Amino acid sequence: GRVFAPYSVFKGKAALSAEPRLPTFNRLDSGGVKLNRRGVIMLTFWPSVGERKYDWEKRQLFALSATEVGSLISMGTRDSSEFFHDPSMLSSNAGQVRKSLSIKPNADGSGYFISLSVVNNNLKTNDRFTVPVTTAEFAVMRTAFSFALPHIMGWDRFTNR
Amino acid sequence: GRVFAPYSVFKGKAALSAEPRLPTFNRLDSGGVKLNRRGVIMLTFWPSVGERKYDWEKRQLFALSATEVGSLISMGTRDSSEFFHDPSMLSSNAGQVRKSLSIKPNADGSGYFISLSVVNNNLKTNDRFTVPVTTAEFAVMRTAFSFALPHIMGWDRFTNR
Amino acid sequence: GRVFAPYSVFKGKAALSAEPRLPTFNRLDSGGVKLNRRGVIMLTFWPSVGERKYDWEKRQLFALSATEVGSLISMGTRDSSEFFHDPSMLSSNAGQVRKSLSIKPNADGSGYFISLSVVNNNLKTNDRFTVPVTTAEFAVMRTAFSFALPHIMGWDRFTNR
Amino acid sequence: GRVFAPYSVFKGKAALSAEPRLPTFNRLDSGGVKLNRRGVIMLTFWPSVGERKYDWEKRQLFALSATEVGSLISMGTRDSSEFFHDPSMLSSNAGQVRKSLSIKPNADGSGYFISLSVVNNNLKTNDRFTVPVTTAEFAVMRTAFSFALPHIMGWDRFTNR
Amino acid sequence: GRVFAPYSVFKGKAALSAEPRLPTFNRLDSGGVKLNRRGVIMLTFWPSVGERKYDWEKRQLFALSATEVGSLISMGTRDSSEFFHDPSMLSSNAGQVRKSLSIKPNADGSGYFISLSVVNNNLKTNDRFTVPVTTAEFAVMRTAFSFALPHIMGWDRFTNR
Amino acid sequence: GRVFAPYSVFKGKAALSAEPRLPTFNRLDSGGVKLNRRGVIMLTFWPSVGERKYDWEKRQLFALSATEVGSLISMGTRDSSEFFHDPSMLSSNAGQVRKSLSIKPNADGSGYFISLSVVNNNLKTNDRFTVPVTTAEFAVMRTAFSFALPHIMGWDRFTNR
Amino acid sequence: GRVFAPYSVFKGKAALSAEPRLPTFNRLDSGGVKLNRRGVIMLTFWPSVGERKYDWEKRQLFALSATEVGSLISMGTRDSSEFFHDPSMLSSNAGQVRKSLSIKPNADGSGYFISLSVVNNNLKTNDRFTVPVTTAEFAVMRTAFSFALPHIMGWDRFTNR
DNA sequence: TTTTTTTTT
DNA sequence: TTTTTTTTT
DNA sequence: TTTTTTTTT
DNA sequence: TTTTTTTTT
DNA sequence: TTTTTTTTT
DNA sequence: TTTTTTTTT
DNA sequence: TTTTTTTTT
DNA sequence: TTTTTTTTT
DNA sequence: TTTTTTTTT
């Protein structure tokens, strides 16, 4: 059964949520099990409409791979990273939509800015949601993501009894 | 005529406002003018009741003297100060109410916490309002307070024509 | 009466101008005066068409709040800031136009780049004007903005006689 | 006769190519020769469609001037530069298309990211090709560009016999 | 009309007061105005007789020139200055009275000592009043003196409307 | 009416004086006011003829723009600047007279040398007046110039009531 | 045949151009070739008359020897050089005209100022053209001059086939 | 007497 | 509502 | 003999 | 127009 | 007993 | 809705 | 396809 | 044209 | 009571 227990941060202009998507497995004829579709850590961004209210209709998604998760948890206070995703990569609609996720430290050292940029060349849209994340909040993510990393890789299937 | 143009900061648990109170002068018989009651920079604190709404009924006040203003504008990024006021000093009700205003830097260096503590021994109350103030916001105060300092001292009366 | 005395910087690809917009006050029935609409420091950008000539028709505006002004005047040589504005915030047309103003130091240390980016999702436009600002020019702004800060806050109404 | 000997770098999401465009000269009536159209170092970017295959149809160009070449070859390991070009500068169609070329070091120090951004306000397109360039690859460019610089300036015409 | 709004510091053995003396102007026949007698910042010292009471009869004065004011406001935490005045300079009674004003930091760094020495060779007197001035108090002076400097120079007459 | 309240420094070989020239405004038909001719800070130099007497007949002038003023007030102890002016710039007599104003620190750190050089190719003259300026004196200028900067820009017209 | 492919920099008050002058050779009777008149790198300066227009009539020239070229290309970011030339050296008109070429870094480190001073004691003229040169522009010169150095020395005649 | 010029209301 | 008080004109 | 391959003219 | 000059083949 | 609240499935 | 793909059992 | 333009021979 | 909003007199 | 003085309009 589905599970919905997102870690969410709500700020001035936008909201950020993160939750794991487990890998899917295929039961081999040989009897064993073979990992099929890889797990990710899914990030959802959406804007604040009005006052302390948020427009879930206008959300944008970004799926962190295991490797991108490893990059986030291994970041220093002063480090920054940027990932670039094509939702329709290798499909017919490649090149049309372009997503970039950036994690930059703020000048104070009091945390990071996490922003998703989405440029759609089909719909002629250019969205950008930015969310400030404290040292404490990013500590929660690093710890939660670290906990989740072995699961999205499916290594939690390697358990004694 | 009265003027109400406060600089205010609204945060999670409380609001902070600041505005100058000009000095009062007494017109000498000799003809000149003599400064009477000294100006201050008045600070008002009040708590947030409910969500992004604030209880003006529960406000507490603290009046910065010229000297206390000079201490605020001359503070370094890393410095902190604390002032201790008795509203009814030298009156019959002295010792009953005790106010302390503290300005402490936050660990990040991203600003300060400005808190007013009010201990009333008559009403058996103990209030405390704390407000986080960014580097930018405190820059506004230092600049606005510096502008205001000569006025609360009444030195703006020393003007050529 | 209206006053037009902008401080302007004209460079290769664009022009930058800055001038204060005073606060508006409402005359209370009580007799006093209450600050209504807040002052800003208005920034105007516009591109250079042809040679040393500029297209005023294509100007874009950005209004610095008191707090954003405090952030500009308190910047170090090596510091950078970025502000993000929605012209139609909280109105029906929110989310449609998105403005970002960035102040970044140049590598030499000889000043800053001040750029306004405007992304309009209604008109499908994406404008960007950048202006190089020397140490001397930014010194003029910091001094002029500092002078103006108490006025846009309306604290120049707190004057003895 | 035309010569096609580009130095090219092929990476995950895009390809980068560079080659010199010689200056054109006009034979004076006086007898001598006068440099007419200036040489450049032409950069071509294009995206990877499918797997290790690239869509030459979707290429974007950027022409480095002598001065921009001088800026590239004089860059330190830790330095970064950004150039901003209007293809139709001073023509009727100015302002419509806007190209920015950035060279930023990567965090490791193992090279640079070289990206071309193209914003077209006529066709409502927003393209961005980024290519990672190792220390060795950028060494090739600096050396090749340095070799080429005197030629695109036409100084290779000043030769004894 | 005369204005009396001194900034005063009261300490153990003596009191210190400071206030601006505006410049006097002469109305030219040509129509304009010509600055006549220069402004100063007047310092008054007087001793404490008895307990927390001060002998205004025994006061001594020292008039800071614009230049001496500039020296005070530009002092570092660790700096010290000394000024030497002859009240009857260039008059018949020159050499008779000799005043020296010293500003020395205290060992702690918690401020300065400001002392006036007056040696009168006519009356055979040798007075010395010293006043401890905190960092906050000297911050008030620097800010108040800086505000006043343009006025004692008469530059506040150069105003648009 | 005209105002003459210069800040002047008199030294061994020459005298230096500085005073603001306000901007001139044009009353729009629209009703408002438009800044016309820009303000400056005017510097006058003249030589000492005889002993402690100065030849006002031989004075030379130099007009600091707002930007040049910003450069002076933002100078470090160790910094130096040089400005180059053509009095008859863009007029028929351009190129004939050439003025250079230099501010260099002296070796001791006890101030600056401020010199005006005037080379006139019409009259075949080459004048040079140098004036030593202490830390205190230059503090007066920085403070006075900073006070004056908003006025020569005409920003003192942006005042609430 | 003559070749005209100068590298030129156009700035506010003056223009700077540089191009190589090859050495002249004398064909020995012995059969070989003997270098006669030495090559230089010729610098031309000329002033800007009007707006972004330059007075080629008023140009002044300065010829860099091989050794002076070696000094320019071996300069550090922080270094400065000055060369002093007599156009009519050893001729009858020696001493009459005096040219000095200076290369000084600007305070920011963003490049250099390159100025030619020409003092003519026959015509009683004193010219001075200064041109700001960025790091990139001076990189072009160093690279172009380095390329040209062997040619002005005539070492490009030592070639295998 | 003064380095100018670029965009409005 | 506000920490006061000390010295004149 | 040589590490190849990816995009044109 | 250009700082020259010093030693050969 | 516990600081809440903001967006779905 | 989600950047894919490469090697088995 | 390419950011231009300013001064000669 | 301009990022708003929160508390009085 | 106050350190002055030097150059105009």
* Terminal CA-CA length for chain D: 22
Measured distance CA(G34)–CA(G26) in Å, rounded: 5
Strands (E), chain E: 3-4, 7-10, 14-21, 25-27, 33-35, 40-47, 60-64, 81-85, 97-105, 111-120, 125-134
Mutate to test the interface with G, among F72, F80, F84 (most CBs of G within 10 A): F84
Q: Chain F partners of G55 at a C-beta cutoff of 8 Å?
A: 95
Neighbours of G128 (CB within 10 A): 19
Q: How far is G101 from chain C (nearest CA, A)?
A: 24
Domain boundaries along the sequence of chain B: 1-161
**d(Cα A131, Cα C114) in Å, to the nearest integer?**
23
- Tell me the C-alpha distance between D118 and F26, whole Å: 44
Q: Quick check: B69 and E140 CB within 8 A?
A: yes
Strand partners, E43: E18, E62
Strand partners, C20: C41
For this PDB entry, the determination method is X-ray
SS (H, E, C) A34-98: EECCCCEEEEEEEEECCCCCECHHHCEEEEECHHHHHHHHCCCCCCCEEEEECCCCCCCCCCCEE
CB-based contact A19:A150 (threshold 8 Å): no
DSSP B24: P
User: Taking a C-beta distance cutoff of 8 angstroms, is the pair C128, C115 a contact?
Assistant: yes
Distance of CA A23 to the CA centre of its chain: 15
- Give A9's Cβ-side CA count (13 Å radius): 24
Interface contact flag, C5 F31, Cβ < 8 Å: no
Using DSSP bridges, classify how beta strands G111-120 and G97-105 pair: parallel, antiparallel or unpaired. Answer: antiparallel
Within chain E, residue ranges assigned H as helices are 66-73, 135-152
Separation in Å, CA of F93 to nearest CA in chain E:
32
Of residues B46, B42, B41, B43, the one with CA closest to residue B15: B46
Contact G129, G60 (CB under 8 A): yes
Say if residues D83 and D49 touch (Cβ distance below 8 Å). no
Closest alpha carbon to C1' of L7, residue: A56
Report, in ranges, which bases of strand N sit under 7 Å from a protein C-beta: 1-9
For A143, phi then psi, to 5°, come to -70, -45
Please report, for residues A83, B133, E75, the alpha-carbon distance to residue A9 in angstroms, rounded to integers and kept in the order given: 20, 21, 48
Chain F residues with CB-CB distance to E153 below 8 A: 5, 7, 140, 144
The integer distance in angstroms from the CA atom of C95 to the C1' atom of O6 is 22
Rounded to 5 degrees, φ, ψ at E151 are -75, -45
Q: How far apart are CA D65 and CA G142, in angstroms?
A: 16
Q: Helices E135-152 and E66-73 sit at what angle, rounded to 10 degrees?
A: 150
Q: What is the SS3 assignment for chain C?
A: CCEECCEEEECCCEEEEEEEECCCEEECCCCCEEECCCCEEEEEEEEECCCCCECHHHCEEEEECHHHHHHHHCCCCCCCEEEEECCCCCCCCCCCEEEEEEEEECCCCCEEEEEEEEEECCCCEEEEEEEEEEHHHHHHHHHHHHHHHHHHCCHHHCCCC
Do F113 and F106 contact (CB within 8 A), yes or no?
yes
The secondary structure of chain F, three-state, reads: CCEECCEEEECCCEEEEEEEECCCEEECCCCCEEECCCCEEEEEEEEECCCCCECHHHCEEEEECHHHHHHHHCCCCCCCEEEEECCCCCCCCCCCEEEEEEEEECCCCCEEEEEEEEEECCCCEEEEEEEEEEHHHHHHHHHHHHHHHHHHCCHHHCCCC
Residue E154 to residue B146, Cβ atoms within 8 A = no
Chain C residue closest to D93 (CA)? C49
Which amino acid is located at B102 in the chain?
S
Residue type, position A62, single letter = F
| Torsion E131-E133-E138-E140 (CA) sign | negative
From the CA of C56 to the C1' of H8: give the distance in Å.
8
**Number of other residues whose CB lies within 10 A of the CB of residue F68:** 19
What is the distance between the alpha carbons of residues C153 and C147, in angstroms, rounded to a whole number? Answer: 11
Crossing angle (nearest 10°) for helices C135-152 and C66-73: 150
Contact C144, F153 (CB under 8 A): yes
Give the phi and the psi of residue D71 in degrees, each rounded to 5.
Answer: -75, -35
C1' of M4 to CA of D51 (Å): 9
CB burial of A130-142 (b: ≥16 within 10 Å; e: otherwise) equals bbbbbeebbeebe
Strands C81-85 and C60-64: unpaired
**3-state DSSP percent of chain G in helix, strand and coil, to 5:** 20, 45, 35
User: F146 Cβ partners below 8 Å, 6+ apart?
Assistant: C143, F73
* DSSP state, residue D48: B
Q: Closest Cα of chain C to G7: distance in Å? A: 20
Q: Do the beta carbons of residue A14 and residue A33 sit within 8 Å?
A: no
Contacts of C153 in chain B (CB under 8 A): 5, 7, 140, 144
Which residues face E111 on adjacent strands? E134
Cα gap F132→F3, rounded to integer Å: 26
Strand L: residues with CB below 7 A: A 2, 4, 6, 8, 10, 15, 17, 44, 46, 52-54, 56; B 51
Tell me if B123 sits within 8 A of E116, measured CB to CB.
no
- CA-based end-to-end distance of chain G: 22
Q: Are F19 and F41 within 8 A, CB to CB? A: yes
Residue type, G146: S
Q: Say whether E133 sits in a helix, a strand or coil.
A: strand
The span from the CA of E5 to the CA of D155, in Å, is: 75
Other Cβ atoms less than 10 A from the Cβ of F123: the count is: 9
CB atoms within 10 A of CB B114: 26
Which two tokens mark B99?
A: 């106010």
Q: How far, in Å, are A4, B31, F5, F139 from residue B158 at the CA level? A: 69, 16, 17, 22
Which residue, D51, D42, D56, is CA-closest to D13? D51
Residue D138 CA and nucleotide M2 C1' are separated, in Å, by: 35
Tally of CB atoms within 10 A around F102 = 16
What type of residue sits at position D60? Answer: Q
- CA–CA gap between residue G141 and residue G135 (Å, rounded): 10
* Residue D8 Cα distances to D4, D63, D65, D110, angstroms: 12, 15, 19, 18
Distances (CA, A) of D12 to D18, D50, D54, D139, G140: 18, 10, 10, 20, 33
Report the half-sphere exposure of E139 (CA within 13 A, side-chain side): 20
Helix (H, G, I), strand (E, B) or coil at A147: helix
Distance, in Å, from the CA atom of A121 to the CA atom of A95, rounded to the nearest integer, reads: 8
Instruction: Spell out the residues 6+ positions from residue B64 whose beta carbon is closer than 8 angstroms to its own.
Output: B40, B41, B42, B43, B72, B83, B145
CA distance B69 to chain E (A): 8
User: Which has the closest alpha carbon to G85: G117, G115, G114?
Assistant: G117
State the residue for tokens 């402690």.
Answer: F52
Q: For residues F22 and C105, what is the distance between their CA atoms, to the nearest angstrom?
A: 32
Phi, psi at D69, each rounded to 5°? -65, -45
Q: How far apart are CA B135 and CA B141, in angstroms?
A: 10
Distances (CA, A) of C104 to A12, A104, C113, C118, G113: 23, 15, 5, 17, 25
| Residue of E140, E69, C160 lying closest to B145 (CA atoms) | E140
Q: Which two tokens stand for residue E110?
A: 């918690």
Alpha-carbon span E32 to F148, nearest angstrom: 20
Helix (H) or strand (E) holding A149: helix A135-152
Token digits for F10?
């008199």
Closest CA to F36 of F146, F157, F129: F157
- Cα separation, G19 vs A63, whole angstroms: 57
Q: Quick count: other Cβ atoms within 10 Å of Cβ G1? A: 9
- The distance from CA F131 to its chain's CA centroid, rounded to whole angstroms, is 13
Resolution in angstroms comes to 2.2
Residue F143 and residue E150 in contact, taking contact as beta carbons nearer than 8 Å: yes
Beta strands in G22-64 (DSSP E): 25-27, 33-35, 40-47, 60-64
Rounded CA-CA distance F45/F60 in Å is 5
Find out whether G26 and G34 touch, Cβ atoms under 8 Å.
yes
The encoded tokens of residue D57 equal 């149809």
Interatomic separation, CA of residue C10 and C1' of nucleotide H6, rounded (Å): 7
By the 8 A CB rule, do E8 and E2 touch?
no
- Please give the Cα distance from G8 to G12 (Å, whole number): 14
CA distance D122 to D118: 12
Q: What is the distance between the alpha carbons of residues F38 and F33, in angstroms, rounded to a whole number?
A: 14
Q: Are E82 and E101 in contact (CB under 8 A)?
A: yes
Whether G130 sits inside 8 A of F84 (CB atoms) is yes
Give the DSSP letter of residue G156.
G
What is the C-alpha to C-alpha distance for residues E21 and D88, in angstroms, rounded to an integer?
64
Which uninterrupted H or E stretch holds B152?
Answer: helix B135-152
**Nearest C-alpha in A relative to D122:** A124
SS3 E58: helix
Q: Which of D159, D161, D150, D158 minimizes the C-alpha distance to D23?
A: D150
| Partner chains of C (3+ C-beta pairs under 8 Å) | A, B, D, F, G
Q: List residue ranges whose Cβ is under 7 angstroms from nucleic strand I.
A: B 21, 28, 30, 32, 34, 38, 40, 42, 60-63, 65, 68, 83-87, 89-90, 99; E 2, 4, 6, 8, 10, 15, 17, 44, 46, 52-54, 56
DSSP label at residue A23: P
| Distance between CA atoms of residues E55 and E47, nearest Å | 6
> Taking CB atoms and an 8 Å cutoff, what residues of chain C touch F161?
157
For residue F44, the distance in angstroms to the closest alpha carbon of chain E comes to: 16
> Nearest CA to B63 among B43, B83, B87, B77?
B43
Distance in Å, alpha carbon of F104 to nearest chain G alpha carbon: 12
Query: Strand L: which nucleotides have any atom within 7 A of a protein Cβ?
Result: 4-9
CA distance B18 to B61: 10
Q: Please, are residues D135 and D111 in contact by the beta-carbon 8 Å criterion?
A: yes
User: In this structure, which amino acid lies at residue C161?
Assistant: R
Q: How far is CA B96 from CA B46, B127, G9, G40, in A?
A: 21, 14, 77, 91
Query: In D95-111, which positions are buried (b, 16+ CB within 10 angstroms) versus exposed (e)?
Result: bebbbbbbbebeeeeeb
Question: Distance of CA C31 to CAs B42, C96, C157, C161, D89, Å?
Answer: 21, 41, 15, 17, 59
Q: Which residues contact B34 (CB under 8 A, 6 or more apart)?
A: B25, B26, B27, B28, E4
Q: Which residue in E38, E56, E36 sits closest to E46, CA to CA? A: E56
Among D93, F37, A154, D157, which Cα is nearest to E160's? F37
Which of the residues C93, C121, C122 would you substitute to probe the A interface, choosing the one with the greatest number of A C-beta atoms within 10 Å?
Answer: C121
Q: At B84, is the secondary structure helix, strand, or coil?
A: strand
- Across the interface, of C51, C52, C110, the residue whose CB is closest to G110 is C110
F75 is written with which tokens?
């100078």
Rg (alpha carbons) of chain B, rounded to whole number: 17
Mention the CATH class of domain B1-161: mainly beta
CB D49, CB A95: distance < 8 Å: yes
By Cβ distance, the residue of G51, G52, G110 closest to C108 is: G110
The E-side interface with B (CB below 8 A) comprises 1-7, 19-20, 22-23, 25, 134-140, 143-144, 147-148, 151, 154, 156-157
The distance of Cα D138 from the centroid of its chain, to the nearest Å, equals 13
Which of B46, B112, B47, B41 minimizes the C-alpha distance to B79? B112
Tell me the residue type at E50: G
Residue of B nearest to A106 (CA): B110
Token representation of residue D53: 């295959």
Distances (CA, A) of G51 to A121, C13, C53: 43, 17, 12
